[PDB]
PDB file of N, CA and C in Angstrom:
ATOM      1  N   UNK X  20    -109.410 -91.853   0.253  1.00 46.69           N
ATOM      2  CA  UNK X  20    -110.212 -92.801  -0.556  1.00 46.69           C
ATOM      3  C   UNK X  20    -111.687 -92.713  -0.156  1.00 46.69           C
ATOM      4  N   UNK X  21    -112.337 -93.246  -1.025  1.00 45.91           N
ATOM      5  CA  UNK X  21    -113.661 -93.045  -0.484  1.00 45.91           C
ATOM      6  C   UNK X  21    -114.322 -94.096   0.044  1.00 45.91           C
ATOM      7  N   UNK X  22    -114.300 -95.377  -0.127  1.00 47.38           N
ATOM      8  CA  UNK X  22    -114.491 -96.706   0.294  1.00 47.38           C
ATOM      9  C   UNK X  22    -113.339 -97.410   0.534  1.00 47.38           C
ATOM     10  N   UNK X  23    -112.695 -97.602   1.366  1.00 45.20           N
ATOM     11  CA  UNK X  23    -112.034 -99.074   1.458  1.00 45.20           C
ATOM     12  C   UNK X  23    -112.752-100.030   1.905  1.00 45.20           C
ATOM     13  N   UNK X  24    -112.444-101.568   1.733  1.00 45.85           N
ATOM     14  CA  UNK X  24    -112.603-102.642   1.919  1.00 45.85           C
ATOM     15  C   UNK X  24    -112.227-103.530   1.758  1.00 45.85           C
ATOM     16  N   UNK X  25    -111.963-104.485   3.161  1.00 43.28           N
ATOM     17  CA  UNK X  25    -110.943-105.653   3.090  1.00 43.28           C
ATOM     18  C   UNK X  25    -111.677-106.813   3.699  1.00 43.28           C
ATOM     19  N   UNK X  26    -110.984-107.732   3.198  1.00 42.84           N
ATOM     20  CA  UNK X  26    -111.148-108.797   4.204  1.00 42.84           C
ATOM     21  C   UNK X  26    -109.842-110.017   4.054  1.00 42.84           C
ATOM     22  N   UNK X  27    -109.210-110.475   5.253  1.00 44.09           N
ATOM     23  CA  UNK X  27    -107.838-110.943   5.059  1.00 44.09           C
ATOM     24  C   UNK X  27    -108.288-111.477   5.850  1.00 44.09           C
ATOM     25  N   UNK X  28    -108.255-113.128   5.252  1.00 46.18           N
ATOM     26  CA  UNK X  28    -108.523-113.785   6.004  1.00 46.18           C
ATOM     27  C   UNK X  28    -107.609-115.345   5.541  1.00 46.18           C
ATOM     28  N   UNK X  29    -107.271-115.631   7.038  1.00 45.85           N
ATOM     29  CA  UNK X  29    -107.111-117.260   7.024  1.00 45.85           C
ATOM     30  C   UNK X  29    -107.767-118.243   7.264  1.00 45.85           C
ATOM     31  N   UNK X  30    -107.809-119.101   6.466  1.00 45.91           N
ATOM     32  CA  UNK X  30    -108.567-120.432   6.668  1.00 45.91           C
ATOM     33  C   UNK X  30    -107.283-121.630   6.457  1.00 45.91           C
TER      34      UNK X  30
ATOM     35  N   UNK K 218    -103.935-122.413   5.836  1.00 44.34           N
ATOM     36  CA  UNK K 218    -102.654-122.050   5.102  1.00 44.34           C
ATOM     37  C   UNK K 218    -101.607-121.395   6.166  1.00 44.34           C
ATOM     38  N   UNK K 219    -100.330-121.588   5.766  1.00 43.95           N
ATOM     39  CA  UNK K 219     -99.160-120.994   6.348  1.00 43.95           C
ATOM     40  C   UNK K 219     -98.762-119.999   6.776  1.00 43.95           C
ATOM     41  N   UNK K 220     -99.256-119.040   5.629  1.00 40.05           N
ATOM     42  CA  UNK K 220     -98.848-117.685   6.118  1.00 40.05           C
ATOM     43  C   UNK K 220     -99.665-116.774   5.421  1.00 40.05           C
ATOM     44  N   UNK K 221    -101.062-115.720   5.815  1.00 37.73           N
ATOM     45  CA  UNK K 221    -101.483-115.255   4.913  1.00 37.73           C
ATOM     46  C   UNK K 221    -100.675-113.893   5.076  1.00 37.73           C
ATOM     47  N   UNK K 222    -100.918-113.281   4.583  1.00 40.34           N
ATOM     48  CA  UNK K 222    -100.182-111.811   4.478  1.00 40.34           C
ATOM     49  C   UNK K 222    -100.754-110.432   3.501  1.00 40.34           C
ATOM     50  N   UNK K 223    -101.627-109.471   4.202  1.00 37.95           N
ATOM     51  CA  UNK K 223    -102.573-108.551   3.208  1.00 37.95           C
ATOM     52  C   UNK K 223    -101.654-107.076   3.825  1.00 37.95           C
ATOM     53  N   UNK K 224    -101.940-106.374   2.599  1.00 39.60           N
ATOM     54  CA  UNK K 224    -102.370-104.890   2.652  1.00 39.60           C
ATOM     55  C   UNK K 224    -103.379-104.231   2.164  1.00 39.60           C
ATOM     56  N   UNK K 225    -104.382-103.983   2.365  1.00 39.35           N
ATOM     57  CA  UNK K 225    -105.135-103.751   1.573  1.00 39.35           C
ATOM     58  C   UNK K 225    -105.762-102.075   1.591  1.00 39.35           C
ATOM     59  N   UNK K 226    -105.008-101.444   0.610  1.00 41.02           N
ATOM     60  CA  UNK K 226    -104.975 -99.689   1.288  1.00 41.02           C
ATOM     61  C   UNK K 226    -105.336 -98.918  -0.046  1.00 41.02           C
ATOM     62  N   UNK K 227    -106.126 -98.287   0.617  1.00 39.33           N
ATOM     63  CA  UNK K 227    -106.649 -96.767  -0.123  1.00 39.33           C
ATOM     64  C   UNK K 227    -105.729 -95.582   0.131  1.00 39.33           C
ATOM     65  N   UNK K 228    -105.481 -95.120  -0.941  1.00 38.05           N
ATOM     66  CA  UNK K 228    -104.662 -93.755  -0.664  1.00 38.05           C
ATOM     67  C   UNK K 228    -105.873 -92.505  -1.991  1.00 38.05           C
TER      68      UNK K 228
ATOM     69  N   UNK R 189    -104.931-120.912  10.597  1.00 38.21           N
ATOM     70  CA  UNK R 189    -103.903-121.151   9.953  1.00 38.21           C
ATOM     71  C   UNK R 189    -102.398-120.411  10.922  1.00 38.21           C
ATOM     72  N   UNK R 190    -101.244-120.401  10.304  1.00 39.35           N
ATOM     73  CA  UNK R 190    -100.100-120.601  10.834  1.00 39.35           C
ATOM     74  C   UNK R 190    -100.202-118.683  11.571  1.00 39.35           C
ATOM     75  N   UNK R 191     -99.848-118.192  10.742  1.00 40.42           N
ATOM     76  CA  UNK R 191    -100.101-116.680  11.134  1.00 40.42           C
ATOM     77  C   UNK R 191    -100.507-115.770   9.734  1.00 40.42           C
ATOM     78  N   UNK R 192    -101.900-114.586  10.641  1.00 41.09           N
ATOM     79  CA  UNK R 192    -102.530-114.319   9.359  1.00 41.09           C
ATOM     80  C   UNK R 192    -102.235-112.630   9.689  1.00 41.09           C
ATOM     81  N   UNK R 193    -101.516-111.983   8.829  1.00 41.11           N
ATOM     82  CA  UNK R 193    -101.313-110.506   8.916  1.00 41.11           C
ATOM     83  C   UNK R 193    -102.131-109.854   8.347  1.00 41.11           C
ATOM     84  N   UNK R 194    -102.548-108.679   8.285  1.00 40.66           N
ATOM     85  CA  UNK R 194    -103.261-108.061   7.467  1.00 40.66           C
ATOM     86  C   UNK R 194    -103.107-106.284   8.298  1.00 40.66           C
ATOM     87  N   UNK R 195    -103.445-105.361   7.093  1.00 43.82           N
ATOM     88  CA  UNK R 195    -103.016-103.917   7.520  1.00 43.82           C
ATOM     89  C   UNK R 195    -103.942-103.472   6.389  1.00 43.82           C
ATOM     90  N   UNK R 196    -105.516-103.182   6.860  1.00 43.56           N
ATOM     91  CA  UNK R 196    -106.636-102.346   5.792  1.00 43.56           C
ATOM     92  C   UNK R 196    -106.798-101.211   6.224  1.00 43.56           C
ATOM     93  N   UNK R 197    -105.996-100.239   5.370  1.00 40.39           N
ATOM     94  CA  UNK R 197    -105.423 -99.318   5.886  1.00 40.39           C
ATOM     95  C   UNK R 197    -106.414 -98.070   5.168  1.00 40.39           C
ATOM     96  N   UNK R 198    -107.197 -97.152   5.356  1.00 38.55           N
ATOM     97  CA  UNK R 198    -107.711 -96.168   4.143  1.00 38.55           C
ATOM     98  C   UNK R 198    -106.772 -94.742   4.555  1.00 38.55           C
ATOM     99  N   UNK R 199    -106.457 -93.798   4.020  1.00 40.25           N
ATOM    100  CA  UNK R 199    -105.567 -92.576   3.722  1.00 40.25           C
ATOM    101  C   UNK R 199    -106.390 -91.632   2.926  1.00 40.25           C
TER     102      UNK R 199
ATOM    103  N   UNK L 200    -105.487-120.750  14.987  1.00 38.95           N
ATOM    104  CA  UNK L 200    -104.559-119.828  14.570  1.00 38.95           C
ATOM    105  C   UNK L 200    -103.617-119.669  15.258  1.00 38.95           C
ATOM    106  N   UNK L 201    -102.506-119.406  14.587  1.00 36.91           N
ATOM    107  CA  UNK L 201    -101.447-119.515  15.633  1.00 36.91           C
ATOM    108  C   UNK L 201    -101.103-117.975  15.839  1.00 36.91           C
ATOM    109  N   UNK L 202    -100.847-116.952  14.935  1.00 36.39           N
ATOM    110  CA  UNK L 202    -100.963-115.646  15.366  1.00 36.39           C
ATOM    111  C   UNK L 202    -101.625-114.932  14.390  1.00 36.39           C
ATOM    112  N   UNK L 203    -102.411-114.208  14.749  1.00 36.77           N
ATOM    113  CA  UNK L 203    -103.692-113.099  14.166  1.00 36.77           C
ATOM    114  C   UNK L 203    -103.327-111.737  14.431  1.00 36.77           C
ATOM    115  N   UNK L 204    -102.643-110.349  13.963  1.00 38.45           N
ATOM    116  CA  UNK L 204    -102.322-109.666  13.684  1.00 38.45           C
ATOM    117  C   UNK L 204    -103.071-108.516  12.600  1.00 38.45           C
ATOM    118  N   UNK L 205    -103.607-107.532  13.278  1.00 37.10           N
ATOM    119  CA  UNK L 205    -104.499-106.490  12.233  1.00 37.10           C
ATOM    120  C   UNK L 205    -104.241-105.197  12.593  1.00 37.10           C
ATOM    121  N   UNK L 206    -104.150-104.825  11.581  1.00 37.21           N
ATOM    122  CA  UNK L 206    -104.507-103.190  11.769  1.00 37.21           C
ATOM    123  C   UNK L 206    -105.098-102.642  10.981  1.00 37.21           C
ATOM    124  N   UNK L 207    -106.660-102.157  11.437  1.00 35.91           N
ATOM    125  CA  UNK L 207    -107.652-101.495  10.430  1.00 35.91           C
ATOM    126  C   UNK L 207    -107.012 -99.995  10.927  1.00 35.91           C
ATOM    127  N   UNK L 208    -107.431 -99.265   9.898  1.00 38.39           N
ATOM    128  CA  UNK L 208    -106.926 -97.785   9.986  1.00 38.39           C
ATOM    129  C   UNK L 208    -107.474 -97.069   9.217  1.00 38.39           C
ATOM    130  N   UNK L 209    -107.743 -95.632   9.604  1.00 36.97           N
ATOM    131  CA  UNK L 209    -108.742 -95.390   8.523  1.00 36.97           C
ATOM    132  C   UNK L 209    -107.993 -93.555   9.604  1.00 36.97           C
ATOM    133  N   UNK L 210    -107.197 -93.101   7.932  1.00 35.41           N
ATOM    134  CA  UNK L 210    -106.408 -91.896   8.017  1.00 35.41           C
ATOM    135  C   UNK L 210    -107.655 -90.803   6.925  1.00 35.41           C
TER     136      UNK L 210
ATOM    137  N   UNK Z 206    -110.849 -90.908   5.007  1.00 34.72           N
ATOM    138  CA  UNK Z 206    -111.213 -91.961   4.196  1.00 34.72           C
ATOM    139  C   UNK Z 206    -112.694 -91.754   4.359  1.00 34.72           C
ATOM    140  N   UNK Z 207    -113.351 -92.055   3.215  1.00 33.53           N
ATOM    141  CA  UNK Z 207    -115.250 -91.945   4.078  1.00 33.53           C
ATOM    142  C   UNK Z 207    -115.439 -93.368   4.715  1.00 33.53           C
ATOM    143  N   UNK Z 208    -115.369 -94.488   4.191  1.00 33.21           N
ATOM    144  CA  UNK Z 208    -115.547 -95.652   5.072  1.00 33.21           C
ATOM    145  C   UNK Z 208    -114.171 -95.962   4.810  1.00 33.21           C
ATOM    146  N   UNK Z 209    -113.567 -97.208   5.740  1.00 31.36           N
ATOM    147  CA  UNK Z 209    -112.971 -98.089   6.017  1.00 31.36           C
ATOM    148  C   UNK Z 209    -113.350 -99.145   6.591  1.00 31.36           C
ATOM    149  N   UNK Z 210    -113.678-100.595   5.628  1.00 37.73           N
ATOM    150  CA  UNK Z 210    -114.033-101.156   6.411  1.00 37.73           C
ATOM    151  C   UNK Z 210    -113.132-102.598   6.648  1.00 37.73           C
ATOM    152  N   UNK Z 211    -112.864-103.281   7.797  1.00 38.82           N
ATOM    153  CA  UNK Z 211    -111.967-104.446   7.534  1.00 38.82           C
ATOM    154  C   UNK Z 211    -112.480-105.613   8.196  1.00 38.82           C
ATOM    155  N   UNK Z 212    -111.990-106.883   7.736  1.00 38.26           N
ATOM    156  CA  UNK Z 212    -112.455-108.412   8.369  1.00 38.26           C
ATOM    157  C   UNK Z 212    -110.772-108.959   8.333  1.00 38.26           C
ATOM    158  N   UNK Z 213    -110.072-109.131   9.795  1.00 35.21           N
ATOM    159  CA  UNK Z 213    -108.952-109.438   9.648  1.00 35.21           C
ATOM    160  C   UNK Z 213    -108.973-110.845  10.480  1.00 35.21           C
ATOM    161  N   UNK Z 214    -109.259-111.977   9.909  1.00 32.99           N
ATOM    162  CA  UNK Z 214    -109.739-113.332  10.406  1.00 32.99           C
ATOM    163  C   UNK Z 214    -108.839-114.114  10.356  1.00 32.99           C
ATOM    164  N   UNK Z 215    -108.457-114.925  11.147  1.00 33.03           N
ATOM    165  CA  UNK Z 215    -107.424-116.250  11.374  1.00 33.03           C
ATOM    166  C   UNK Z 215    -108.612-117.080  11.676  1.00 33.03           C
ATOM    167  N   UNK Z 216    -109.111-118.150  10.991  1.00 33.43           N
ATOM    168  CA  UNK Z 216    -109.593-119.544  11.305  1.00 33.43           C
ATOM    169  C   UNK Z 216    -108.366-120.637  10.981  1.00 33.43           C
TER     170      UNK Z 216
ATOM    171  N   UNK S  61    -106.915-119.588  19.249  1.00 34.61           N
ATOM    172  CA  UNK S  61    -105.487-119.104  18.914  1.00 34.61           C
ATOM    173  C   UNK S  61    -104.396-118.632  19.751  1.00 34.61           C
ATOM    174  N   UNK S  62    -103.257-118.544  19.172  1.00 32.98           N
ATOM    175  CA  UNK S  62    -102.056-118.626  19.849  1.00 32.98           C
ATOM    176  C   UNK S  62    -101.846-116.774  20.573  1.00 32.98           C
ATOM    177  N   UNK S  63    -101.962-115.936  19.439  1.00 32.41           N
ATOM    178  CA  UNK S  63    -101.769-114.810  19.522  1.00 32.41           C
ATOM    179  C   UNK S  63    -102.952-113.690  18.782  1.00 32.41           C
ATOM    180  N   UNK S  64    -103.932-112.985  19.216  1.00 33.84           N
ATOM    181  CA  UNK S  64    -104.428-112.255  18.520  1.00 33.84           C
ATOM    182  C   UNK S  64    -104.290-110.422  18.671  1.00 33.84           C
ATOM    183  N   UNK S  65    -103.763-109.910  17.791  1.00 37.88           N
ATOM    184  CA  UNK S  65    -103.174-108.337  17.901  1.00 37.88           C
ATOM    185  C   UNK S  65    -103.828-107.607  17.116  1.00 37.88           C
ATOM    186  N   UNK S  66    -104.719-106.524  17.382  1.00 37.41           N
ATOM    187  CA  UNK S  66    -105.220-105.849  16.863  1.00 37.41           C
ATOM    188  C   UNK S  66    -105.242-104.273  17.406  1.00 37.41           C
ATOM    189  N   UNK S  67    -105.179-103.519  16.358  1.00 37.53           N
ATOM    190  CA  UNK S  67    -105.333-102.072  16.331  1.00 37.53           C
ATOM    191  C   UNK S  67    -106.177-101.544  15.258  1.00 37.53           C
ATOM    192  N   UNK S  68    -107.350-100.888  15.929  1.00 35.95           N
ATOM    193  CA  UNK S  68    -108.043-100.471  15.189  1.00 35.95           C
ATOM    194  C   UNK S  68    -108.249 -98.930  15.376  1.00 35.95           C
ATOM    195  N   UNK S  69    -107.913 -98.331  14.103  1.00 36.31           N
ATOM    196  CA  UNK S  69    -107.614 -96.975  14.916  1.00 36.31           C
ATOM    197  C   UNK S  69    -108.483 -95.879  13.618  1.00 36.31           C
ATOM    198  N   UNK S  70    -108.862 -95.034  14.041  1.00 34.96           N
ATOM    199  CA  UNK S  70    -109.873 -93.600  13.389  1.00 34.96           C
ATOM    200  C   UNK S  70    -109.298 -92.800  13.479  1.00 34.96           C
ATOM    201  N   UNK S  71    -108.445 -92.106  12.319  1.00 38.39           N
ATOM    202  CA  UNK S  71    -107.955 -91.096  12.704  1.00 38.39           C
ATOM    203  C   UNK S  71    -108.421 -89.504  11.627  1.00 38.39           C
TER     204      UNK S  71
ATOM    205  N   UNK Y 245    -111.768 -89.625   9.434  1.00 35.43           N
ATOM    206  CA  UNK Y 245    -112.167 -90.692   8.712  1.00 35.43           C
ATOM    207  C   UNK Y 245    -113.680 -90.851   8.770  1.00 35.43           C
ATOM    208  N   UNK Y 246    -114.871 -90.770   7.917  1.00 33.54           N
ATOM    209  CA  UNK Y 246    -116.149 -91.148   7.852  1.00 33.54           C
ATOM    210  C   UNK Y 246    -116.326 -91.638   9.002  1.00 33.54           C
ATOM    211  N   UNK Y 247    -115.638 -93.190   8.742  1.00 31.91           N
ATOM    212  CA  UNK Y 247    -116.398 -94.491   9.144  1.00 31.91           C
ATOM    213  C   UNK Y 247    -115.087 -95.577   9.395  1.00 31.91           C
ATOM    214  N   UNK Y 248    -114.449 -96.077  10.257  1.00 28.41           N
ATOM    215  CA  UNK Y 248    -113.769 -96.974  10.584  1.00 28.41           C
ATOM    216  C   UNK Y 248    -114.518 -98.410  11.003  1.00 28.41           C
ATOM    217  N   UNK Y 249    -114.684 -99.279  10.344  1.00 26.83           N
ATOM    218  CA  UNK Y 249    -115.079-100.552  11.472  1.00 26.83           C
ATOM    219  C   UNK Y 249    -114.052-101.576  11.245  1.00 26.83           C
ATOM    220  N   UNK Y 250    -114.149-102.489  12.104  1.00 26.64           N
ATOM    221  CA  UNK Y 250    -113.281-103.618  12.300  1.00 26.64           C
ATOM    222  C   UNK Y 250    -113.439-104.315  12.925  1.00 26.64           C
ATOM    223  N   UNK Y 251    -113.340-105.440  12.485  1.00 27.99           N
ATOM    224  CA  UNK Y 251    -113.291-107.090  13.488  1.00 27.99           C
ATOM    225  C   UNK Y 251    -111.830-107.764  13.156  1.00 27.99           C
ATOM    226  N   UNK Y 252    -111.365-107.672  13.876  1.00 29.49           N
ATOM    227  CA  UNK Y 252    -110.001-108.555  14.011  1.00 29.49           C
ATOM    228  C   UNK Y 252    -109.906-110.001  15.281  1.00 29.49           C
ATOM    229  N   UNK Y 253    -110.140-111.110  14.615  1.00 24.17           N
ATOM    230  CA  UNK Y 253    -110.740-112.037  14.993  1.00 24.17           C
ATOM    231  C   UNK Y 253    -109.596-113.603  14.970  1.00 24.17           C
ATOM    232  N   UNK Y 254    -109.592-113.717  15.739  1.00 22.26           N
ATOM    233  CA  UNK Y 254    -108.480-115.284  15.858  1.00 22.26           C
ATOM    234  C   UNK Y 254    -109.646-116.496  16.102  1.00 22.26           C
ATOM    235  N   UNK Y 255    -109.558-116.870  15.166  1.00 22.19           N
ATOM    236  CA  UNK Y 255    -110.666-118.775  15.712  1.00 22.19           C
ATOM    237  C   UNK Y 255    -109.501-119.743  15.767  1.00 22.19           C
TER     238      UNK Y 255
ATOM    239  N   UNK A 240    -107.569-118.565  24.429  1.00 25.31           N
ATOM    240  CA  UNK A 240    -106.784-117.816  23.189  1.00 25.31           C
ATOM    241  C   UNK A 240    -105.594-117.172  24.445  1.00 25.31           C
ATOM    242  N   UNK A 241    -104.625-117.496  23.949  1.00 25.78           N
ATOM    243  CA  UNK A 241    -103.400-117.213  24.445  1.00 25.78           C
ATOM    244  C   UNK A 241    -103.229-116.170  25.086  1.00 25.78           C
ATOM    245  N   UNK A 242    -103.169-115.244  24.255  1.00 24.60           N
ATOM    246  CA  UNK A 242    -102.635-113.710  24.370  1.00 24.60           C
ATOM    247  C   UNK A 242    -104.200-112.869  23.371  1.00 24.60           C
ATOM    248  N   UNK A 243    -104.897-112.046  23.783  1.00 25.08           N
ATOM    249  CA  UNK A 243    -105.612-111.140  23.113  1.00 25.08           C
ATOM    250  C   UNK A 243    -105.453-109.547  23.516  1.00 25.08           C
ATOM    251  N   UNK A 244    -104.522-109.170  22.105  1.00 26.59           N
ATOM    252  CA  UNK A 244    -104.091-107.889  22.579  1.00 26.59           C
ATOM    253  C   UNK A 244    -104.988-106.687  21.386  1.00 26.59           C
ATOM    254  N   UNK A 245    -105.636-105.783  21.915  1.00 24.22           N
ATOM    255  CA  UNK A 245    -106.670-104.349  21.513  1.00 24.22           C
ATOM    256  C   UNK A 245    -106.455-103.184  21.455  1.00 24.22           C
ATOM    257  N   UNK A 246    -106.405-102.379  20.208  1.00 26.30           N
ATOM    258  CA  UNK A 246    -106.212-100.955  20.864  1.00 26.30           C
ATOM    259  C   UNK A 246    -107.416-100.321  19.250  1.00 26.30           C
ATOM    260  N   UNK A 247    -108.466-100.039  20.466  1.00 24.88           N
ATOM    261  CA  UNK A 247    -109.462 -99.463  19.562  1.00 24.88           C
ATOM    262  C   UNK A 247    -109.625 -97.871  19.802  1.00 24.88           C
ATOM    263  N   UNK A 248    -109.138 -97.290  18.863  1.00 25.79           N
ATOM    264  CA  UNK A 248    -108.619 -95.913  19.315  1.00 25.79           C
ATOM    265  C   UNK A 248    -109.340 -94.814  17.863  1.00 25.79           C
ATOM    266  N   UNK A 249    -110.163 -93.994  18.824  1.00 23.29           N
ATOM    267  CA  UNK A 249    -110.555 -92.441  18.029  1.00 23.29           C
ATOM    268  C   UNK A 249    -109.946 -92.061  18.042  1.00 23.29           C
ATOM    269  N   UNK A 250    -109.481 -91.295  17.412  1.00 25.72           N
ATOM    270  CA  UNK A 250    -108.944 -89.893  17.150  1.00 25.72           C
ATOM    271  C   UNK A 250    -109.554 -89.079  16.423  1.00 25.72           C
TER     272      UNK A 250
ATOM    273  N   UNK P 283    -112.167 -88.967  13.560  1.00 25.60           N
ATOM    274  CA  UNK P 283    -113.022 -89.745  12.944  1.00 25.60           C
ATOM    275  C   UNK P 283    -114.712 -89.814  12.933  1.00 25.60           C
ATOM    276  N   UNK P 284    -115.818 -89.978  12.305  1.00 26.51           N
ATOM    277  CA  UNK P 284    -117.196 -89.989  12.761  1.00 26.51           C
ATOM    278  C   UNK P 284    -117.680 -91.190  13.481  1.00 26.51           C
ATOM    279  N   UNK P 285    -117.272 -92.439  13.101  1.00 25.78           N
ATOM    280  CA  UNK P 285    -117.450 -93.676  14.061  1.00 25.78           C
ATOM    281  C   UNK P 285    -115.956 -94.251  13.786  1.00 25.78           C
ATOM    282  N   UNK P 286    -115.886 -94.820  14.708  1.00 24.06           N
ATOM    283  CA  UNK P 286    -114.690 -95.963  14.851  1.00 24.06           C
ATOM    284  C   UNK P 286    -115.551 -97.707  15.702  1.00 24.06           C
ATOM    285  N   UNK P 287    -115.591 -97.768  15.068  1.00 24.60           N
ATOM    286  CA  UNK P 287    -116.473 -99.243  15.480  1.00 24.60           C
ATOM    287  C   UNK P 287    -115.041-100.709  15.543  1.00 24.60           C
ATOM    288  N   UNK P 288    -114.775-101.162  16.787  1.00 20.68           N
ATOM    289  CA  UNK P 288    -114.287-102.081  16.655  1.00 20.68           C
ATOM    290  C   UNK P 288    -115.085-103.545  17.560  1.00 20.68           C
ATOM    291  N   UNK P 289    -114.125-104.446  17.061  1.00 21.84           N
ATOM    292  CA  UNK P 289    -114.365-105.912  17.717  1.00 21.84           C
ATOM    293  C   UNK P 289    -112.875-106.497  17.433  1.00 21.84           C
ATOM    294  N   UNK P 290    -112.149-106.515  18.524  1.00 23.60           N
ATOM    295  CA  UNK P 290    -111.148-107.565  18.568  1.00 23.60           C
ATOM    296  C   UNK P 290    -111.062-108.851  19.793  1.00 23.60           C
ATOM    297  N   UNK P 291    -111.379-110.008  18.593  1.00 21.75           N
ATOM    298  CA  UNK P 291    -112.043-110.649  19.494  1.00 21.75           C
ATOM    299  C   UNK P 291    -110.775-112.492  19.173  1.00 21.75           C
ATOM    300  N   UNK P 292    -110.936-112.945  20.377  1.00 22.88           N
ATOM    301  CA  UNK P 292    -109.856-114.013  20.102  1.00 22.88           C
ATOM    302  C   UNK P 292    -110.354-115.049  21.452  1.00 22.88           C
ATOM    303  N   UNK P 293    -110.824-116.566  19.915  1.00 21.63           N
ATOM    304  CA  UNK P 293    -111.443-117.591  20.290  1.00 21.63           C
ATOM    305  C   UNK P 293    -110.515-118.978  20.475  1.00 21.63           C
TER     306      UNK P 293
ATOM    307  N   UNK I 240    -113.386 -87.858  18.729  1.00 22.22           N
ATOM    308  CA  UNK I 240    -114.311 -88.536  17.755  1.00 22.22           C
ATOM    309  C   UNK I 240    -115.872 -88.855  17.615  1.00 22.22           C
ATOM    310  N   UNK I 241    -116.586 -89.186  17.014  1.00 25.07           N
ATOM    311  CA  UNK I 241    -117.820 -88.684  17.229  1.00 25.07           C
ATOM    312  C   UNK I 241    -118.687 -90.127  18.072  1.00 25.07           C
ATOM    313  N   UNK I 242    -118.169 -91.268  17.738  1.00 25.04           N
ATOM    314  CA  UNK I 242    -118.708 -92.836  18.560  1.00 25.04           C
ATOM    315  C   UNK I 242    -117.586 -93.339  17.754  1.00 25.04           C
ATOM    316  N   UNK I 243    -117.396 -93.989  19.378  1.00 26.91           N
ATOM    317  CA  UNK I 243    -115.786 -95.426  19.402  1.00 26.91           C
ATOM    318  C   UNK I 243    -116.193 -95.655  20.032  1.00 26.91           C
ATOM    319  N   UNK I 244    -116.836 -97.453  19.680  1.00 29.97           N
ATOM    320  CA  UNK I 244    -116.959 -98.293  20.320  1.00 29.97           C
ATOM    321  C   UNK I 244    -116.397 -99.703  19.712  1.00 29.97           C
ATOM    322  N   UNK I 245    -115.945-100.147  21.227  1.00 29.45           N
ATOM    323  CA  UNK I 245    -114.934-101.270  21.391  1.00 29.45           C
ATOM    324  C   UNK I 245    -115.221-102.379  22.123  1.00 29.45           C
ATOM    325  N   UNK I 246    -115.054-103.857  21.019  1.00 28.40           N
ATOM    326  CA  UNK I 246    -115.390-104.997  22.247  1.00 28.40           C
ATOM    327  C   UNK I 246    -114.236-105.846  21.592  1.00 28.40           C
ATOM    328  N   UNK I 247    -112.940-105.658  23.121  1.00 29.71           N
ATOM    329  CA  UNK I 247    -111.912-106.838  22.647  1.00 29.71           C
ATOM    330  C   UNK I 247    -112.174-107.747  23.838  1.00 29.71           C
ATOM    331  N   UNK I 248    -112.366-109.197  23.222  1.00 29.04           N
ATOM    332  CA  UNK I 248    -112.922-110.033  23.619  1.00 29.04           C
ATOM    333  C   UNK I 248    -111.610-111.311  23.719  1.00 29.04           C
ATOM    334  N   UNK I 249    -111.843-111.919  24.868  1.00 29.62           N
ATOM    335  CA  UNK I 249    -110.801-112.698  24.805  1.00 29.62           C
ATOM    336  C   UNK I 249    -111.826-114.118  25.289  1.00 29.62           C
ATOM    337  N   UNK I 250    -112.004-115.173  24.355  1.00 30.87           N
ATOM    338  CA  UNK I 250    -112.695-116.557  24.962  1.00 30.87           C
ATOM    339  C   UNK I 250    -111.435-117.375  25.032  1.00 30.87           C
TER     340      UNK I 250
END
């Protein structure tokens, strides 16, 4: 892939 | 929250 | 929060 | 948090 | 992968 | 937090 | 992999 | 924080 | 990998 | 790998 991006987040 | 739960994937 | 998983995975 | 669990990965 | 980027957060 | 697990891995 | 970053973070 | 477990790994 | 940048960090 | 850098942090 050429970019991944995450964000997993708990609040 | 309870339970978060990610995958977050590039193939 | 309770439990937060996450797997940002790139391939 | 009670458990925080990640795996960034980058294949 | 060219980037991978991740935010794996429990607040 | 209770538990924090991380693997961050470049492969 | 390019570029791996990561913050895997318990508050 | 309880337990803080790391594995920041090149390859 | 070219960078592997981590922070596993537990507050 | 070319830079791995790592800060697992336990407060």
């Amino acid at each position: 892939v050429g970019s991944n991006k995450g964000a997993i987040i708990g609040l």
